[PDB]
Each structure stands twice: as C-alpha cells, then as structure tokens.
Design a protein around this ligand. Structure first.
Ligand SMILES: CC(=O)N[C@@H](Cc1cc(F)cc(F)c1)[C@H](O)CN[C@@]1(c2cccc(C(C)(C)C)c2)CCc2[nH]ncc2C1
Length: 380
C-alpha cells in the first residue's frame, strides 16, 4: 500500500530515527534505529541502565543460536554480542515475516542513549561492511530474498515543528517503494558508486552561490556517503575549513565563541529573533547518472543549525572528518531520499516536511553539467 507506512518513524533530535519491529515467537516489540551507515541488525538482549526493554531469546521458540561472537565499533559507541536468527516483522511496514540475522547485544559502551526510546539498530547498507564479515546477510537483503518486496526503500526524515500523535520529530520509511504524497517536484538520481556504504560523488560545492573552488576529489576524499545514523554533515578537513571560513564571513555581523564552530557550545537568540538571513545556503552538487544531468541539493541554515534547549538555542551541525563526507540526518531532513538499490542509485526530492524560511527555499534543482566520477572520485 505505502499509506500504512507513512509516519512510521519517531525520534528525538540528534538521537536518530527509529521504527517499531517485532522479534521472536511470540513477537517481542522493540524500537529500532534506522541506519543507512551500517549493515548489522542488532538489539539489546540483556539489561542496561538506559534500556526500557530487551530481546529475551529464551522466550522465543523460533530463536536459533549461530554460536558466533560479533562486535561493531561506530564513531564513538560500540557493542558486542552473540549472533543468532529469528523471525522479524515490521508492524507499520510490509505485511511479511522474515528469518534474519540478529546480533543479540550482551554488552555495550556509549551506544544506548539515556531516554532515547530505541533498543536496537537496523543497518540498511550492504554486506561488504557487515561484521564480523560480508557473509552475514543484512536484514534488507534477507527481506528481499524471502519475500516479493521490491529492492528499494525511501526515507523522509522530518525536523521539529510537525504534528505527531518519546516526542519531537517523526518521519517515514517506505519499504518497497516510493510514496508520492511525501514529496513535491522531481526526483533527481545520483549513482551509488559502490555497494558498501551508500557511496555517492559530490562534483561541486557552492556557498551562497559562490563556488568553493577546490579540486572536487577533496569533496570525496576517502569517500562520500548518505548516512541516516549520523546527525551532522561531516566534511573532510580541507573542505570543512574552507566552508567554515565562508560561513563565518557571511555571518560576520555577529560573533560566536570558537566553541560554537567546533559543535561543542550552543548559541541563543531571544525567541523568534534568530537571524537566519546572515547564515548562507550550502549547495551540494551530486553527479548525475549522465553527467549533463547532475543536480544540486540546497541546505538552509534551519538544517545545519540544529535546535536544542537551555530561548531559541542552536548547535552548529557541521563537523570535521578525517574519514570522508558524511551526509547525515541534518542533510536528509527536508528531502525525500530514495535508496534505489535495484538500479544502484539514490534519489533526492523536496520533502513535504521541508524547512520554512520566509525568503529562501530548500531545493533539488537541475540539470547541471559537471565533472565525472573519474575527475571527482578518490581511488582507495
Ligand atoms: C554517530 C554514529 O556512530 N552513528 C552510527 C549509528 C549509531 C547511532 C547511534 F544513535 C548511536 C551509535 F553508537 C551509533 C552509524 O552507523 C555511523 N556510520 C558511519 C560508521 C562509522 C564507524 C564505523 C562504522 C561501521 C563499522 C561500518 C558500522 C560506520 C559510516 C561510515 C563513516 N565514515 N565516517 C563516519 C562514519 C559513520
């Protein structure tokens, strides 16, 4: 249908977006973080101070132990666990059940977040980056192989301010297709360069219409990916420095502590007086499937200035990286993103929950003629 899947995501700002899932027999309900930046399906399977509930394998008649250990280290957090298989469903997803690999998390460190409301993670990327090795079939590969669900999903991650009905921000994960009521305008597609992370190629970057003027290999230095499990826009050292230099220049009328630009300190303004006009729009051009059909996604300050609290407070959500460009949640917010795995491409369109701005508007625009995968792709 797809209507049954609209609004199936919830989350707290900066703590990921999650979807309801069931595991075992009888079905045990768990909220699971949707992560396109990994490929392991893992759930709390032991008591933890921040876990409201967890997966009890002893109470599932369909549980099968694989007699194998596993661990996954992320950017900061990590967990270890025991591999097994079990029946998995998504109540607000397709009407199907599948036997999938499940990493039963037995110990963890800085993985679970206090009061987040999620108890596990659903890695939606490819087998190549799955631990302990690529022989561990990811959930989405299992879903597609065992059912007739088409090989593609879409994510509409919404920012704050939209009606929901535990709170702040919602979204949609349409499994097996594209829901047209979730976006406006045209969907533009960029190739998945390789099936491991959802890797793409950035061919140009503009700040307030002014080209950053860098060797485009710098934009994809190491790699460039789409990652719903990461909050910030992460930029390679050199791009980060040139970008923050343009953003500081554009916003020079006001001055902020060095801590602000490092993403550690917050900045506030009397309620409703946020001076959005002095922060520029960032345009990221993605390589077209055909290079005279490239396109840009335009990000407003309402996206890269993430709202928090203690009247209107904000965190700078652009960070330095030594591991490539990561287009995180703040980038995906306000766009409808199609992970068209069947045709090895990712689509972008303006979301129905796009960010406001009285004088500017987020956009997905093209066509543009640009450089190639060969000119812009870093070869590792
Ligand atoms: C912030 C973060 O760590 N997000 C991850 C999901 C997550 C959400 C959460 F709420 C708590 C938590 F502990 C983890 C997500 O998987 C991160 N994904 C990347 C990644 C980094 C370290 C290793 C991994 C694999 C080995 C592949 C799992 C992935 C993708 C690749 C990459 N290059 N630079 C940065 C990244 C981020």
């Amino acid at each position: 249908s797809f209507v049954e899947m609209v609004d199936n995501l919830r989350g707290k700002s900066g703590q990921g977006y999650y979807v309801e899932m069931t595991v075992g027999s009888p079905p045990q309900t768990l909220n699971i973080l949707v992560d396109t930046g990994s490929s392991n399906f893992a759930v709390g399977a032991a008591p933890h101070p921040f876990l409201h509930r967890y997966y009890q394998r002893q109470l599932s008649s369909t549980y099968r132990d694989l007699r194998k250990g596993v661990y996954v280290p992320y950017t900061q957090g990590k967990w270890e666990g025991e591999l097994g298989t079990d029946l998995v469903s998504i109540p607000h997803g397709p009407n199907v059940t599948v036997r999938a690999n499940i990493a039963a998390i037995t110990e963890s460190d800085k993985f679970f977040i206090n009061g987040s409301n999620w108890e596990g993670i659903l890695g939606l990327a490819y087998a190549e980056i799955a631990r302990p090795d690529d022989s561990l079939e990811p959930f989405f590969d299992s879903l597609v192989k065992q059912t007739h669900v088409p090989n593609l999903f879409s994510l509409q991650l919404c920012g704050a301010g939209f009606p929901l009905n535990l709170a702040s921000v919602g979204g949609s994960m349409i499994i097996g297709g594209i829901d047209h009521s979730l976006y406006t305008g045209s969907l533009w597609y960029t190739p998945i360069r390789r099936e491991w992370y959802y890797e793409v190629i950035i061919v140009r970057v503009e700040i307030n219409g002014q080209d950053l003027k860098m060797d485009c290999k710098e934009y994809n230095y190491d790699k460039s990916i789409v990652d719903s499990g990461t909050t910030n826009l992460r930029l390679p050292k050199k791009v980060f420095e040139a970008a923050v230099k343009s953003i500081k220049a554009a916003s020079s009328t006001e001055k902020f502590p060095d801590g602000f630009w490092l993403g550690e300190q917050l900045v506030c303004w009397q309620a409703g007086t946020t001076p959005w006009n002095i922060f520029p729009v960032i345009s990221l051009y993605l390589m077209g499937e055909v290079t005279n059909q490239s396109f840009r996604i335009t990000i407003l300050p309402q996206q890269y200035l993430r709202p928090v609290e203690d009247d209107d407070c904000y965190k700078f959500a652009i960070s330095q990286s030594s591991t490539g460009t990561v287009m995180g949640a703040v980038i995906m917010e306000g766009f409808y993103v199609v992970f068209d795995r069947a045709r090895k491409r990712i689509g972008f369109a303006v979301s129905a929950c796009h960010v406001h701005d009285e004088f500017r508007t987020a956009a997905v625009e093209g066509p543009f003629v640009t450089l190639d995968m060969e000119d812009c792709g870093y070869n590792i």
